[PDB]
Amino acid sequence: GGPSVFLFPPKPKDTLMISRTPEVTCVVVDVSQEDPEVQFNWYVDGVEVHNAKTKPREEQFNSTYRVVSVLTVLHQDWLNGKEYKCKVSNKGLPSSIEKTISKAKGQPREPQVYTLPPSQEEMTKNQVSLTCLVKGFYPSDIAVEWESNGQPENNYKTTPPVLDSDGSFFLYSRLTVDKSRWQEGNVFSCSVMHEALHNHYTQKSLSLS
Amino acid sequence: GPSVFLFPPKPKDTLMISRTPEVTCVVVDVSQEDPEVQFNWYVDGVEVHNAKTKPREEQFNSTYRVVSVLTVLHQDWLNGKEYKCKVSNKGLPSSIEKTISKAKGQPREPQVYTLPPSQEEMTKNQVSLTCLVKGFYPSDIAVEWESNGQPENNYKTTPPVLDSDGSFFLYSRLTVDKSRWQEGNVFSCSVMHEALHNHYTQKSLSLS
Ligand SMILES: *[C@@H]1O[C@H](CO[C@@H]2O[C@@H](C)[C@@H](O)[C@@H](O)[C@@H]2O)[C@@H](O[C@@H]2O[C@H](CO)[C@@H](O[C@@H]3O[C@H](CO[C@H]4O[C@H](CO)[C@@H](O)[C@H](O)[C@@H]4O[C@@H]4O[C@H](CO)[C@@H](O)[C@H](O)[C@H]4NC(C)=O)[C@@H](O)[C@H](O[C@H]4O[C@H](CO)[C@@H](O)[C@H](O)[C@@H]4O[C@@H]4O[C@H](CO)[C@@H](O)[C@H](O)[C@H]4NC(C)=O)[C@@H]3O)[C@H](O)[C@H]2NC(C)=O)[C@H](O)[C@H]1NC(C)=O
Ligand SMILES: *[C@@H]1O[C@H](CO[C@@H]2O[C@@H](C)[C@@H](O)[C@@H](O)[C@@H]2O)[C@@H](O[C@@H]2O[C@H](CO)[C@@H](O[C@@H]3O[C@H](CO[C@H]4O[C@H](CO)[C@@H](O)[C@H](O)[C@@H]4O[C@@H]4O[C@H](CO)[C@@H](O)[C@H](O)[C@H]4NC(C)=O)[C@@H](O)[C@H](O[C@H]4O[C@H](CO)[C@@H](O)[C@H](O)[C@@H]4O[C@@H]4O[C@H](CO)[C@@H](O)[C@H](O)[C@H]4NC(C)=O)[C@@H]3O)[C@H](O)[C@H]2NC(C)=O)[C@H](O)[C@H]1NC(C)=O
C-alpha cells in the first residue's frame, strides 16, 4: 500500500487581499492505524519553516486516517512565485514523500472587464441576466463578485476560466436579479480581483439608463 | 496498471436522425508486454456484440491506445439506456467496468439570448459577440456560430454551469474584427438541444 499526499494552493481572494490570510494545505490520506505518528516538514524555496498548524488524525469510513497540515504564507512570497514543499514522513521510517506547489509561471496579463445589460428579449421573463465578461488575464487565478449599493449580491454564478487563443483566459459571471430591481434604476457592480490589476481590484457598474 | 475511459456520443449526432451517434470506450496505458485487450458491451444489462474495435496505436511514452466504438440508436440514448464497457486484459487483474447514460430528468427548453459588444470594447481591434444559453437540461448541447450562412470559426464556449434552479447555462463568445461588426454583417448563434422544436434554434445579432 502506502499513504498518498496532496497539496492545495491558497484561495485567490486570500492572496490578493493584504487583510486576509493565504494558506497552503497538505493532506495525507490512506494512513493506517498502526502507522507511526505522521510528521510534516515545510520548505519555502528550500528553507525550512515551522509556523504550520498540524491537525489530528481523522478517521475515514474506509478504515484509513486523514491528516492535514496548514501553512500560512506571505502574500508577497506566493505572488513572487516562491516554491512550497511538503515533506511527509512517519516517525522513525526512512521512506519520505515530497510534493511541491507554486504560482503559475508566466507573464501576468491584466484582465479587461465589460458589463453587458440583459437582452431585450429577456425583459419578458420575471428575472433578467446581468453579464460580466472578464477576458485576457493570466494566470487563471481570479475572483469575481457582485454587489449593489454596497451590500454583496447573492444569486450569481461564474463559469470556469476558458483558455483563449492568445494564451490568456476569459470567463463570464452571470448575476440573476428580479426584473423589478433592474427597472427601478438600481446600480449593480462587477468586482474583479486579479494580481495584474492596480491594487488587485477593479469594478464596473451596470444600471438601466 | 492501465486505465479505461468512456465517452458519450456527440450531442449533434444524437439530435439528428441523419447522423450516427456512437459510444466510445478507450483503453490507454496498455504496455507492449501484453497487447491483447477484450471488450464486452452491455445495453441495459443485455450484452451486445455488434461493436467494432480499432487496432492498437503507439504512444510517445511507450504505451498503447486501443479504442472500441459502439453505435447506438437515437431513441435508445435519449431514453436513458445504460451503456456498459467491460475491458478484459492481462494487465488488469479484474476486468474494469465503466457505465454511461443520458442524465435522467425532465428536459427543459434552453433560452438563447444574443448580446452585442460592450461600448468599452469598441476601442479594441476585435469585439466580442456573446450568446447566452440558459435554463436547459440535460447539459448535452451544441452551440455554433455562422455569418450569412457560412460557419464562423473564431469562437470559444464555456462548459455548462449548474444554476441554482437545477438547470444549466453557458456562454459562447465569437471574436470578430471590429470592422466586420461595424459593416453590418449578421451573425447567428445556433443551438441544438433535445427540448427544442426540431432540435434546433438560432438567434441573430447585427449592428442595426
Ligand atoms: C478513503 O477515503 C478517503 C476520504 O474520502 C472520503 O471518504 C470516502 C469514504 C468517500 O466517501 C469519499 O467520497 C470521500 O471524499 C479518500 O481520500 C481521498 O483520496 C483521493 C485519492 O485517492 C483524493 O483524490 C484527490 O482529490 C484532489 C482534490 O481533492 C479536493 O477536492 C475533493 C472534492 O473534489 C475534496 O473531497 C478534497 O478534500 C479536496 O478538497 C480540497 O481541500 C483543500 C484543503 O482541505 C481546500 O483548500 C480545497 O478548496 C478543497 N477543494 C475542493 C474542490 O473541495 C484531486 O485534485 C486529485 O487529483 C489529482 O491527483 C490524481 C492522482 O491521485 C490525478 O489523477 C489527477 O489528475 C490530479 O492530478 C493533479 O492535477 C493537477 C492539475 O490541476 C496538478 O497540478 C497536480 O500536480 C496533479 N497531482 C497529481 C498527484 O497528479 C485526487 O483525485 C481525495 O481528495 C481524498 N478525499 C479526501 C476527503 O481527502 C481515500 O482515497 C480512501 N482510501 C481508500 C484506500 O479507498
Ligand atoms: C501516454 O500518452 C497518452 C496519450 O496522451 C497524448 O500523448 C502524450 C505524448 C501527450 O502529448 C499528451 O498531452 C497527449 O494527450 C496518455 O493517454 C492519456 O491519459 C490521460 C489520463 O492519464 C487521459 O486523460 C483523461 O482525459 C479525459 C478526456 O479525454 C478526452 O479529451 C482529451 C483532451 O482533454 C483527449 O486527448 C482524449 O483523446 C479524449 O478525447 C475524446 O476522444 C473521443 C474519441 O472518439 C471523442 O469521442 C471525444 O469527443 C473526445 N473528447 C474530447 C473532450 O476531445 C478526461 O475526462 C479524464 O479526466 C477524468 O479522469 C481522470 C482520471 O481518471 C480523473 O482524475 C478526472 O478527475 C476526470 O474524472 C472524470 O470526471 C468526469 C467529470 O468530472 C466524470 O464524468 C468521470 O466519471 C470522471 N472519471 C473518473 C475515472 O473519475 C482524463 O484526464 C487522456 O485522455 C489520454 N490521452 C488520450 C489521447 O487518450 C497516457 O496517459 C500517457 N501515459 C503516460 C505514462 O505518460
Numbering used by the authors:
A (entry chain A): 236 to 444
B (entry chain B): 237 to 444
Sentences reproduced from the published study:
The Fc region of IgG antibodies (Cγ2 and Cγ3 domains) is responsible for effector functions such as antibody-dependent cell-mediated cytotoxicity and phagocytosis, through engagement with Fcγ receptors, although the ability to elicit these functions differs between the four human IgG subclasses. The IgG4 subclass binds certain Fcγ receptors with lower affinity than IgG1 and IgG3, and does not activate complement. The Cγ2 domain FG loop (residues 325–331) plays a crucial role in the interaction with Fcγ receptors, in which Pro329 from the FG loop forms a hydrophobic “proline sandwich” interaction with two tryptophan residues from the receptor, and is also involved in the interaction between IgG1/3 and C1q.
The asymmetric unit of the room temperature (RT) recombinant human IgG4-Fc crystal structure solved from crystals in situ contains one Fc molecule, comprising two chains (A and B). A heptasaccharide core, covalently linked to Asn297 in the Cγ2 domain, was modelled for each chain. The RT structure belongs to the same crystal form (space group P 21 21 21) previously reported for the cryogenic recombinant IgG4-Fc crystal structure, and the overall domain topology is comparable. However, the Cγ2 domains adopt a slightly more “open” conformation at room temperature i.e. they are further apart from one another compared with their position in the cryogenic structure. Comparison of this structure with the recombinant human IgG4-Fc structure previously solved in the same space group under cryogenic conditions revealed that the Cγ2 FG loop from one chain (chain B) adopts the conserved IgG1-like conformation at room temperature, and the unique IgG4-like conformation under cryogenic conditions. However, our structure also demonstrates that when either conformation is accessible, the Cγ2 FG loop from the other chain (chain A) does not sample multiple conformations, and adopts the unique, IgG4-like conformation at near-physiological temperature.
